Design an enzyme around this catalytic site. Sequence first.
Site, short mmCIF file in Angstrom:
data_model
loop_
_atom_site.label_atom_id
_atom_site.label_comp_id
_atom_site.label_asym_id
_atom_site.label_seq_id
_atom_site.Cartn_x
_atom_site.Cartn_y
_atom_site.Cartn_z
N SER A 9 -10.83 -3.39 -6.71
CA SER A 9 -11.30 -4.25 -5.46
C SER A 9 -12.17 -3.77 -4.61
CB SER A 9 -9.84 -4.50 -4.58
OG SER A 9 -8.89 -4.97 -5.64
N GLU B 91 -6.93 -0.81 7.27
CA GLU B 91 -6.16 -1.17 6.24
C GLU B 91 -6.33 -0.71 4.81
OE1 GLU B 91 -3.67 -3.52 6.65
OE2 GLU B 91 -3.98 -3.80 8.94
N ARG C 232 -4.40 -13.52 0.23
CA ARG C 232 -5.20 -13.23 1.49
C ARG C 232 -5.84 -14.83 2.06
NH1 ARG C 232 -2.75 -10.05 3.52
NH2 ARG C 232 -1.56 -11.09 1.98
N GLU D 104 -12.59 -10.54 -0.99
CA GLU D 104 -12.64 -9.79 -2.19
C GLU D 104 -13.39 -10.08 -3.43
OE1 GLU D 104 -8.53 -8.73 -3.47
OE2 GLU D 104 -9.47 -7.32 -5.13
N1 LIG Z 1 -10.07 -1.44 -0.87
C1 LIG Z 1 -10.73 -2.19 -0.68
O1 LIG Z 1 -11.73 -2.52 0.42
C2 LIG Z 1 -10.20 -3.71 -0.90
C3 LIG Z 1 -10.93 -4.76 -0.44
S1 LIG Z 1 -9.62 -6.12 -1.19
C4 LIG Z 1 -8.43 -4.81 -1.56
C5 LIG Z 1 -7.03 -5.04 -1.92
O2 LIG Z 1 -6.27 -3.83 -1.78
C6 LIG Z 1 -5.06 -4.08 -2.58
C7 LIG Z 1 -4.96 -2.70 -3.57
O3 LIG Z 1 -6.10 -2.44 -4.16
P1 LIG Z 1 -6.85 -1.08 -4.34
O4 LIG Z 1 -7.77 -0.88 -5.92
O5 LIG Z 1 -7.07 -0.15 -3.34
C8 LIG Z 1 -5.44 -0.28 -5.07
P2 LIG Z 1 -5.73 1.22 -6.09
O6 LIG Z 1 -4.83 1.23 -7.56
O7 LIG Z 1 -7.06 1.97 -5.99
O8 LIG Z 1 -4.94 2.22 -5.24
C9 LIG Z 1 -5.31 3.29 -4.67
C10 LIG Z 1 -4.40 4.62 -4.88
O9 LIG Z 1 -4.02 4.75 -6.39
C11 LIG Z 1 -4.31 5.91 -6.74
N2 LIG Z 1 -5.66 6.22 -7.33
C12 LIG Z 1 -6.60 5.32 -7.21
N3 LIG Z 1 -7.55 5.41 -7.94
C13 LIG Z 1 -7.37 6.76 -8.46
C14 LIG Z 1 -8.07 7.47 -9.37
N4 LIG Z 1 -9.22 7.00 -9.78
N5 LIG Z 1 -7.54 8.72 -9.75
C15 LIG Z 1 -6.37 9.22 -9.49
N6 LIG Z 1 -5.69 8.34 -8.56
C16 LIG Z 1 -6.28 7.16 -8.02
C17 LIG Z 1 -4.41 6.88 -5.30
O10 LIG Z 1 -3.13 6.92 -5.05
C18 LIG Z 1 -5.20 5.90 -4.50
O11 LIG Z 1 -5.02 6.36 -3.10
C19 LIG Z 1 -5.25 -5.11 -3.57
O12 LIG Z 1 -4.27 -6.44 -3.03
C20 LIG Z 1 -6.59 -5.70 -3.33
O13 LIG Z 1 -6.59 -7.07 -3.44
N7 LIG Z 1 -8.91 -3.64 -1.23
#
Ligand SMILES: NC(=O)c1csc([C@@H]2O[C@H](COP(=O)(O)CP(=O)(O)OC[C@H]3O[C@@H](n4cnc5c(N)ncnc54)[C@H](O)[C@@H]3O)[C@@H](O)[C@H]2O)n1
Length: 223
Positions: free
Chosen positions: A144, A156, A181, A186
Amino acid sequence: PLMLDTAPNAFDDQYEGCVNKMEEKAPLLLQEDFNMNAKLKVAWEEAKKRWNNIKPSRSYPKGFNDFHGTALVAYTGSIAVDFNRAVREFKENPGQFHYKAFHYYLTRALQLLSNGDCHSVYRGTKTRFHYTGAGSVRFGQFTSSSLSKKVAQSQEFFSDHGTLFIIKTCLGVYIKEFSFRPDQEEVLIPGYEVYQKVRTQGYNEIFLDSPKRKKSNYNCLYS
Ligand SMILES: NC(=O)c1csc([C@@H]2O[C@H](COP(=O)(O)CP(=O)(O)OC[C@H]3O[C@@H](n4cnc5c(N)ncnc54)[C@H](O)[C@@H]3O)[C@@H](O)[C@H]2O)n1
């Protein structure tokens, strides 16, 4: 810190050549995923209700069906973290992957929604990412991001201990319409997009440029 590399162990299936076969087999696969993944089943049932409400407001690409819509809605919901982990750690122990159908439908939703337009997006994290110099980068998991840097840097998603990715994506899909949202503006990026230009700036900015679609390590695995 977490490593940023080519995601060699991620389940990155692009389903080249088996879309017809998967559309026939994924419904059965989905029942299997649910039978062994209570959290996914709950997230899916809830997402199906929201999808029902979203669906009438617009038309979707030809072939985009309720599975594609419900998978995308569910993904913007609470199930993303567990799903992404299962995908990232796939090769580790691919006997317990209970998102066989979910991964297909979500992958296919983005493929159907992507026209090819490229976007400048930003992704904020609270965990520091270290580029391990592989030469290129793939996220591995669905990733994302937002069209808005403001959103990506908001408390956030971001903190000084994490990383801000500045990304040029050409496979990412603007999924505002689908999100629980959707002011997060996104853009959901497939994990198999490759960034041929990787540049770290300071301790927490990583610039990912020169996107390209390249073959994945897995293809039609469950077809
Ligand atoms: N991050 C943004 O700017 C953004 C914009 S819209 C959005 C929303 O955020 C929510 C979650 O999305 P997100 O992708 O952050 C969830 P994502 O699966 O990245 O979760 C992040 C966590 O998972 C683990 N992780 C992630 N990547 C790795 C990796 N490469 N190696 C080992 N561990 C890892 C760690 O705990 C990390 O802190 C969704 O509802 C999405 O719509 N996020």
